[PDB]
Amino acid sequence: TYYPPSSFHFLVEFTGIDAKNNDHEFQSVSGLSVDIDTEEFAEGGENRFKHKFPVKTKYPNLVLKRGVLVDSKVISWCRDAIEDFEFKPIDLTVKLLNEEHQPLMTWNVVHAYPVKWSVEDFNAQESKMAIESVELSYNYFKTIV
Amino acid sequence: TYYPPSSFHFLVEFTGIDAKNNDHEFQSVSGLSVDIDTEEFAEGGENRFKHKFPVKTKYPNLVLKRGVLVDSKVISWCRDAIEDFEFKPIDLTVKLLNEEHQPLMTWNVVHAYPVKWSVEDFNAQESKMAIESVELSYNYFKTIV
Amino acid sequence: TYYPPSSFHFLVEFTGIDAKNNDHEFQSVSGLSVDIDTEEFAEGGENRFKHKFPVKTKYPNLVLKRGVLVDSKVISWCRDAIEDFEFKPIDLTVKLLNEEHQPLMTWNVVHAYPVKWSVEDFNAQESKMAIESVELSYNYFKTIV
Amino acid sequence: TYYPPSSFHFLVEFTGIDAKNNDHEFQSVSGLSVDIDTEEFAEGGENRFKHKFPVKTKYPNLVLKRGVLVDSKVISWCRDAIEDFEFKPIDLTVKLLNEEHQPLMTWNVVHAYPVKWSVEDFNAQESKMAIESVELSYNYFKTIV
Amino acid sequence: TYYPPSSFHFLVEFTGIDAKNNDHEFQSVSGLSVDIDTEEFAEGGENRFKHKFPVKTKYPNLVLKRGVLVDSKVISWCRDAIEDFEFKPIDLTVKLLNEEHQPLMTWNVVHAYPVKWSVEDFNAQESKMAIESVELSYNYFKTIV
Amino acid sequence: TYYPPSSFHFLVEFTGIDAKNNDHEFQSVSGLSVDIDTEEFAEGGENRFKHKFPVKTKYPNLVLKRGVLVDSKVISWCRDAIEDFEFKPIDLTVKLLNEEHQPLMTWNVVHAYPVKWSVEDFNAQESKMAIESVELSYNYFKTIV
Amino acid sequence: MAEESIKKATEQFVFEPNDGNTWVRVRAMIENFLILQWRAGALAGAKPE
Amino acid sequence: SYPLSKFHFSVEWGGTKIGFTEVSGLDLETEIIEYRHGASPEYSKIKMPGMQKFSNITLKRGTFKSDNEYFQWYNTINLNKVERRDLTISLLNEEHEPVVTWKVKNAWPLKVQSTDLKGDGNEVAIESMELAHEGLVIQNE
Amino acid sequence: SYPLSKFHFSVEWGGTKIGFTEVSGLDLETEIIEYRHGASPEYSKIKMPGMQKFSNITLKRGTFKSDNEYFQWYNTINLNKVERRDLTISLLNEEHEPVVTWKVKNAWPLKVQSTDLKGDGNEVAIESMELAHEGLVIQNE
Amino acid sequence: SYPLSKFHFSVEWGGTKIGFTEVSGLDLETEIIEYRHGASPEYSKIKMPGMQKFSNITLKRGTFKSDNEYFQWYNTINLNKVERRDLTISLLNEEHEPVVTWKVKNAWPLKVQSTDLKGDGNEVAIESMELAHEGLVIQNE
């Protein structure tokens, strides 16, 4: 913009999981990008370049981090998939906020489910917070702005 | 939480091995995580994404470190497997503790056995403690909280 | 030259997309280079070297970076290709400028289209600007100087 | 222990080679560890984990370092194997010592022979000691403590 | 020598391209080396070593760097090959100079042609010179001294 | 020894090449080492270890570095092999010296010939000496001490 | 049919604050319902627009 | 028409006494984010505000018989728990009333430093404390 | 035939008073790009101008009753927004008119520093501010 | 109504004498863990207590004939073994009784420093010792 916005003020909301204020707060969000797979072809007589063709649109997994929370609803949902193969996809909204705490821009993440859950190593000789990490697979996203 | 807990106060307990206080104290614990293997498929006519399907739940080995202890019961158990192929799996509990020294949260590790044992290199010109390391394979874990 | 020019003053212009002043300003430009693929052959009796032959001219993708802009025309164009497979290639001009703000030298980029779009990770604990990145595929370029 | 021992006081002894005091002194010892090779299997109907089975116990080579000694008996033994393929395996003892210079713990290394010998690079512009390195293959080890 | 020469005073000259003083000045030159490809063979009964045989002499490409020059004759020559597949190999001389600006030693580079041309990335936030790079393939070289 | 020797005082001599004092002085020497290739076998019923067997003795190439010398005899010898495939192997002696400048220990390098020759990159903006590097292949070595 | 399904989907927002952070969530949800109906062949049009 | 002096003040910290020898560290600070796009006619950057910081506060007092207030507060730390307090610092007028007030949120003690002893140390034994906090507001009406 | 003195000056910053105790940091700076081609007869580099920089400006004043101008300006910061001002600094003659003027574009406050308190601090309480800006022009006609 | 002085004190360390010239390093320190979640309205971090530290203690005394107490304690170190002692430091009243006591757990000597000799060194030869320990408790009743 004339002065572009910073990246440290944002909100993560879930649809299909009971809401709690402690499940909307995260330390970091990553994975909001996309790419197109292509193929190459050489045409006889054309020596200046090879041709390139698109094939598929590709998205990476969405990664969320925060300090450990013991009564999380999101984690209970993750456990049902992890332990029993019960899968029930959800939708999600990522919001980048302005100074009035209203959205500048949002991302609509469609049909997501859990593929990973972990907690970082313990160390008796270091002063650190216990950090939790969750990774989700989804089909695509759209933006609103 | 409002103020998340730190990670430097914890306890490791074994079931099926004679207890000694010196076998419950460790410098570091790692490996408490999980992931899901998936497969991909391209559907003709659908050019927005590929489909992804789950196949299996996967767990990494559990790794424990401490200073060298010469009369350990855990090591005697490791030696029977290492030297004679006598295997007798055990269960284990990992506890993350609060200020009253009671569990905040625990991990139930099921059917574990030894796959690795080592001691770090000696060096005549450095001032260092001798460190021992043990790695265990297990089937799965559950959490209680 | 006697005193070679610096690299911090330049302009990016698009043909086929409605113009806005905010879409001509970028933080960084990269990818203006080329190479020739070759093949090798060993001739019996010639032991001093192998022969090398040219096959094809090759170009890398063009990469543009800037702070996040919410109403960009270039991004709307990228979305049509990304979301619906509607492709409509454009031409582009890269200009390296002198002190009168006139071109020292320009690059003519021919038949370009979008293959990638991303925004860098958010971090609640760091003071940073949100940065956007766009990558384009093209056939070749020519220079004017 | 209550206070674990340090790692800078130790002794290396050989059986089957004429003894000299200068062949029992080393700068560093490494390789005293072990691991178990495993295989995986997926059982139809069991989607919580894959099965893992042990196959073999594995040991790394033993590595010794010291300053260059010109009349070493150990090196004469290494040369017979290296130059003429005359192999005659030996046993070895690694001792970790206490303050009375008696063993805390020892390692019994069984049926060892030489696989490597080297001396580090010379450099006219650096002030350094010439360092020699010897690597041995062995079948297994046992511990006494 | 008794006092070996330094490497910061040298000249690059081209044969077959119209001369200009601005095309003989470079920031850096690299690639003046050579190697011999070999093959191995094990002879039954000989256990001290394997035999090695030479096959071919090999040379790397020659790489030149300088600040960007807009009216270069060398670049016009590079463009004819790059854009139209018109190839016309040239010879080249690399000269290492003494204090009277006469050659200490020279390299005769035979039958060279262009395989690469690039210019380094632009960055609006850094104070830097625009740098150009050219890479040439050749058959062999000889030295005169 | 009681006090091991340092590594900065040594001499390189050639047999079969006319001697000059300027060809016996080097900045650095490397490659005086050896190893034994082995194979593995698993015996049914033996689950404590795999068997290992020796196959061949292996040596690395010998590498010499120094400041550039223009009238070297060693380089003329290297050129005959490099340019015309005329190969005539030589023997070589590496000497590690004491304070009376007499050998502490020597290495006898047998049947050597040139496989590589290079000179490091020139840089107009750095104050550096021009450095030359030569690499030789040989069959084996013996030591005298 | 379509009206009943949307009506049920919006019940979850009845007692939410009436501001931009709600308006955006209501839109995203309705659009997701409709894009599925479009892919299914109920709605006309080459692309969602 | 005259400025205020710096020696008459008081500190309310939840202890039994409000007299101190020295108070320091009442600072506020903001980070700066810089930017320049390649086509700009100016060869310098544009600046805007980033995230905010606060400094630690240091308090100094003389040691008195049977007063162990500093140690006792420090000793309330239990793993990740501590007693947090509201700290009020005030510059006083001739009627001993507030003129300028510094309001500090959520303070706790980071370190407690004791005195050094000397055979020829003809001086007062002075103890000190360093406090962490989460915010400062300045009032001057 | 005589040089100017350094004690009679004024500062216009959008506040209610123009008197200050101390002003510093009115600097200008340019980077240098160096080059040498291997064939040159000289064994040193040629130099040319790079990108430009500006220093931060520091202002110092005494604390007065009911004057909270520094805090109030600082407190206009709201995420990436701040009130920006034109700062004019001037050296005065005997008629109290400008002689030398320093013109500063887009300034805002980076930090506000309060005073330290001492039991034996027989002095004036002095507050200070540090300002960021985007450019300086010097006028002396 | 008066503060304590700093020159009348004693040290009990297991040796034969309790008189010292100088004592220093009786400090306590705690680390700080910081946190901020992206959705917070405040642009600063929340703080909580981490792990704890202690400083080494330095003791200084004059050299006397036939007194080698410092060396003898140091010389009890044998690889990883050492004689550990309870160190008690006390500030005294006019009756030579304790007022303020510092209690130190498990101390041993890290270093022993001897004096420097000078031809014109018209002064007392002073030796010193630095001690490691595992904890400090402060008593003032």
Automatic annotation (TrEMBL), chains A, B, C, D, E, F:
Keywords: Acyltransferase, Transferase. It comes from the Bacteria. It holds the Pfam family Phage_T4_gp19. The keyword Transferase applies. InterPro entries: CHP02241, Phage_T4_Gp19. One of its GO terms (molecular function) is acyltransferase activity. NCBIfam families: conserved hypothetical phage tail region protein. This is Phospholipid/glycerol acyltransferase. It comes from Algoriphagus machipongonensis. The lineage of its organism: Bacteria, Pseudomonadati, Bacteroidota, Cytophagia, Cytophagales.
From TrEMBL, chain G:
Belongs to the myoviridae tail sheath protein family. This is Phage tail sheath protein FI. The lineage of its organism: Bacteria, Pseudomonadati, Bacteroidota, Cytophagia, Cytophagales. The chain holds residues 595 to 643 of 692 of the full protein.
UniProtKB/TrEMBL annotation, chains H, I, J:
It holds the Pfam family Phage_T4_gp19. It comes from the Bacteria. GO terms for molecular function: structural molecule activity. PANTHER family: CONSERVED HYPOTHETICAL PHAGE TAIL PROTEIN. This is Phage tail protein.
